[PDB]
Amino acid sequence: VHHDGFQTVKATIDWEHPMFKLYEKAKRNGKWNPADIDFSQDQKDFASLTSEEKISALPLVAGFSALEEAVTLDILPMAHALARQGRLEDVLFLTTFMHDEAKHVEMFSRWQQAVGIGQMDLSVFHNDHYKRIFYEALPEAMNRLYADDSPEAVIRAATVYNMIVEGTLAESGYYTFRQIYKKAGLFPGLLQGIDYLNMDEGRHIQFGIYTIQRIVNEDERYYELFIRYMDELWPHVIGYVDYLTELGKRQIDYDLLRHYVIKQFNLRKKQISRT
Amino acid sequence: VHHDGFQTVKATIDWEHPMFKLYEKAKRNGKWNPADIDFSQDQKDFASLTSEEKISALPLVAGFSALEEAVTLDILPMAHALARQGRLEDVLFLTTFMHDEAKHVEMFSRWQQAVGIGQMDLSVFHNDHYKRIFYEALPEAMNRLYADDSPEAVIRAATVYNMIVEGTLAESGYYTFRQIYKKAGLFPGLLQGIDYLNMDEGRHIQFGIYTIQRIVNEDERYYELFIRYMDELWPHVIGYVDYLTELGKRQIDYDLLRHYVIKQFNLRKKQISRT
Ligand SMILES: CCCCCCCC(=O)O
Ligand SMILES: CCCCCCCC(=O)O
Ligand SMILES: [Fe+2]
Ligand SMILES: [Fe+2]
Ligand SMILES: [Fe+2]
Ligand SMILES: [Fe+2]
Ligand SMILES: [Mn+2]
Ligand SMILES: [Mn+2]
C-alpha cells in the first residue's frame, strides 16, 4: 500500500526522538567485526580438550547459534509494523539492531567453523522447552504483527523477543559462558566476541523497554498484560535451564546460574512501570 | 510460522556464497557516519544564494529525500521473502543494505536542517510521474512479496527497486548533482555525503543483479519479463526527468543529463543475460 508522503520531505527526522538518539549511539559503538577476531587459540583450546570436555561446551553454543539466527530473522515483522505506523526513527534504529544480530550469528558460526564442529548437527541439544520458545512462540508472536499491530500484539512481541529471549535467556547465557570459560582461561576469541555482543544487546533491550513502556503509558491495562506474557513463558525458560543443568551435571555453581536467570527475569519486570 | 531448524546449528554459514562475500565487503567499506559530515560551509553557501538560486536546488533534494526514505522502508518485504526461503546469507547482506539506506535518509535530512529548509514542505516538487513510481509502484511491488514470493514477483520487485529506482534514477541523480555543484564549488558537505552514498549503492546494485540473474538462470522466460517490467516504468522515469528539466529551464547541459538516464537504463539491461 502507498506512501502518503515522506517525513524527510515534509519536515525532518525527529532529532530528539529517543530511538534516534539510540541509533546514533549504535553507529558510534557498533564498529566491531567478527571477521577480525583471532580464533586460532580457541582452535588449539578445543582440540586439547578431551571428548567429554568437548561436548560439555556444545549445548550452550547450540542454544546461542539458534538464538541469534532466530532473532535476526524475527525482528523483520517488528520493523515492518513500526514502519507502517510511520515511526521513522524506530525504523532507523532497528536497521542497526538487525545488523548487530547478523554479526552475532556470524560470530558463533565462525567459532564453530574454527574449532572444527561446523559439520556437527547441534540440534540434538534443543529440548522441547527450547523449541517451544525459539522454534514456535518467538516467530509466532513476531509474525502476528503483519496482520495485527494492535498495542496488545506489539507488547506481546516485544515481551517474547526483547524481555524473555534477549533480556532473560541471552543475558543469562552470556553471563554463564563468561563465568565458566573466563576462569578456565579458555576460548579467548569467543569471549571477545561475547563481550562485543553484550555491548550491542544493551541497546537492544532499551528498544524493548521503550516500546513496551510507551504502550503501557497509554493504558495501565497493558501493564497487567506484560506481566502475564512474561509469566506465560517462564515455564519454558526454567524448563530449558533445568535441561542444561541436567546435561552438565551429567558431564560450576548451577544453583547460582539458575538464580541469575530468576534475577534477570524479575529485573526485566522492574524496568516497566505501571505509570 | 515455525522455524524448522537453524542453518548455523545444523551446519554453518555458506562462506563462499556471493551475498556473504558482499556482506563482508559492506562491513569493511560501510563505516562512514553522516553525523561526522561538516555542513557549516553548505549553510553559508545556501544563505549566499539568491532566492531564485535557492529553489533551483530544491527539486532534486526533494526527489532524493523521498527516494531514500522509500527504499529504507520498502526493502523490508524483500528481506522477509528471502528469510522465509531460508536464504540466510542474502538476509545477512540485506541488514547492511537497510542500514546503508538509513544513513542515506539521515544524510539528506541533516543537510536540509543545516541549510535552513527543514521546515519547508518539499512535496510540491513531486509530480504525477514521481508519485507513480515512489508513492505507488515501488511499495506495491515490494509489499506483494508478503503474499506472493513467486520468481515473477521477486524479479518484478528487484526490477522496480534495484534496477529502476536505484540503478536508473538514483544513479543519474547522483551524477547530475555532482556535475552541477562540484563545478560551482558549492555544498562540499553534501557532495561528500553523495560520494559515500554512491559507494554504498555499488553494493546494492550487485544484490539486485544477483537476484534477477539467479531467477533468470532457472528459466529464460523470465528474461523477457525483466525487460518488460523495465520498459513499463520508463514512461514515468522520463516523465519525471522531463518535469525536472522543465523546472530548471524555467530558473547545465540538460540534453546530456537526459542522455545519462537513457544510458543507465540501457546499461542495467545489459547486466542481465538471457543465459
Ligand atoms: C544454565 C543457566 C544459563 C541459562 C541461559 C542459557 C541461554 C542460552 O544458552 O541461549
Ligand atoms: C535531470 C536528470 C536527472 C534525473 C535523475 C533524478 C533522480 C532523483 O532526483 O531522485
Ligand atoms: Fe539483540
Ligand atoms: Fe519439561
Ligand atoms: Fe540502495
Ligand atoms: Fe506526463
Ligand atoms: Mn544478538
Ligand atoms: Mn540509498
The answer to whether B133 and B237 have CB atoms below 8 angstroms apart is yes
Element (H, E) at A112: helix A88-115
Give the residue ranges of the annotated binding site of A. Answer: 68, 101, 104, 128-129, 161, 166, 201, 204
Considering only residues 39 to 98 of chain A, which have any Cβ-Cβ distance to chain B shorter than 8 Å?
62, 65-66, 68-70, 72-73, 76-77, 79-80, 83, 88, 91-92, 95-96, 98
**In terms of C-beta distances under 8 Å and separation of at least 24 residues, what long-range contacts does A84-87 make, across chains too?**
A84/A149, A85/A149, A86/A7, A87/A19
- CATH code: domain of residue B117: 1.10.620.20
- Whether A173 is in the pocket of ligand 1, judged by its Cβ within 6 Å, is yes
- Classify A18 in phi/psi space as left (phi over 0), alpha (psi -120 to 50) or beta: alpha
A-interface mutation test, from B7, B12, B60, B165, most A Cβ less than 10 A away: B12
Q: Report the nearest atom of ligand 2 relative to the CA of B176.
A: 3
Q: What is the CA radius of gyration of chain B?
A: 19
Element (H, E) at A104: helix A88-115
Compute CA distances B142 → A144, A146, B151, whole Å.
19, 14, 13
Among residues A131, A154, A9, the alpha carbon closest in space to that of A81 is found at A154
CA distance B22 to A275: 46
Domain count, chain B: 1
Resolution of the coordinates in A? 1.6
Amino acid residing at A89? E
Give the count of alpha carbons within 13 A of B73, CB side only. 31
Q: How many CB atoms lie under 10 A from the CB of residue B267?
A: 13
CA distance A73 to A79: 11
The answer to whether B100 and B30 have CB atoms below 8 angstroms apart is yes
User: What's the longest Cα–Cα distance across chain A?
Assistant: 64
Compute CA distances B190 → A66, A135, A197, B31, B257, whole Å.
42, 46, 34, 17, 20
Residue A252: which domain range? 1-275
CB within 8 Å of B57: residues ≥ 6 apart? B46, B49, B181
CA distance A259 to A243: 15
The answer to whether A58 and A125 have CB atoms below 8 angstroms apart is yes
Establish if A16 touches chain B: CB-CB under 8 angstroms: no
Q: What angle do CA A248, B6, A80 make, to 5 degrees?
A: 125
Of A15, A70, A102, the CB nearest to B92: A102
- Classify A65 in phi/psi space as left (phi over 0), alpha (psi -120 to 50) or beta: alpha
- Classify B42 in phi/psi space as left (phi over 0), alpha (psi -120 to 50) or beta: alpha
Give me the count of residues in chain B. 275
Mutate which of B244, B246, B247, B259 for ligand 2? The one with the most ligand atoms within 8 Å of its CB, which is B244
CB within 8 Å of A138: residues ≥ 6 apart? A70, A71, A74, A160, A161, A165
What one-character-per-residue DSSP string does A171-210 give?
HHHHHHHHHHHHHHT--HHHHHHHHHHHHHHHHHHHHHHH
Element (H, E) at A49: none
Establish if A161 touches chain B: CB-CB under 8 angstroms: no
Look up residue A111 and give its three cell numbers. 567459532
Three-class HEC string of chain B: CCCCCCHHHHCCCCCCCHHHHHHHHHHHHCCCCHHHCCCHHHHHHHHHCCHHHHHHHHHHHHHHHHHHHHHHHHCHHHHHHHHHCCCHHHHHHHHHHHHHHHHHHHHHHHHHHHHCCCCCCHHHHCCHHHHHHHHHHHHHHHHHHHCCCCHHHHHHHHHHHHHHHHHHHHHHHHHHHHHHHHHHCCCHHHHHHHHHHHHHHHHHHHHHHHHHHHHHCCCCHHHHHHHHHHHHHHHHHHHHHHHHHHHHHCCCCHHHHHHHHHHHHHHHHHCCCCC
Experimental method: X-ray
